[PDB]
């Protein structure tokens, strides 16, 4: 019973998780992921500026109201191309990873590691902080509170 939690840099508070490594979160899902990193879902204009201090990925994710891929450098695989933060417009599925918002975070960029995850509740699954650099901070918890996701 556990879950990887693959976090990225932060920049202006903003990074970047995905679950297991897969597209795996909900709506429902991410807004509880990030409240447990004692974070919200960004804003677009908070992505914008996490955007102009040196944030990019090529995966999927939840904002607020959007899923967004930030592009700094134009690239044939990821978001076709685009550059800035990239919006998807048609998809027929429901489920990609998240960003996240943490106000306590560095004002431009941070790539220290995650070591906690403070905001997690009691209970059964293992959960583990996966860091870029391969550091890894584990503790017994949850964080769903929508039954349809667990
Ligand atoms: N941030 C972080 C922390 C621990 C593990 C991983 C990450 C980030 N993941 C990025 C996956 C990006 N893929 C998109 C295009 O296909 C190859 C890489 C790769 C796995």
């Given at each position: 019973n556990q879950i990887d939690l693959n976090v990225t840099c932060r920049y202006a508070g903003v990074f970047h998780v995905e679950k297991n490594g897969?597209?795996?979160?909900?709506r429902t899902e991410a807004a509880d992921l990030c409240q447990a990193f004692n974070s919200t879902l960004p804003t677009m204009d908070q992505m914008k500026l996490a955007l102009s201090k040196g944030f990019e990925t090529c995966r999927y994710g939840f904002i607020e109201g959007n899923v967004v891929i930030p592009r700094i450098h134009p690239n044939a695989?990821?978001?076709?191309?685009?550059?800035?933060?990239?919006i998807l417009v048609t998809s027929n599925t429901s489920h990609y990873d998240t960003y996240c918002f943490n106000a306590?975070?560095?004002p431009e960029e941070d790539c220290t590691s995650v070591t906690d995850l403070p905001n997690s509740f009691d209970g059964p699954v293992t959960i583990t902080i996966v860091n870029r650099d391969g550091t890894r901070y584990s503790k017994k918890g949850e964080y769903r509170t929508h039954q349809e996701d667990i």
């Open positions: 897969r597209y795996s979160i909900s695989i990821c978001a076709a191309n685009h550059t800035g933060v990239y306590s975070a560095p």
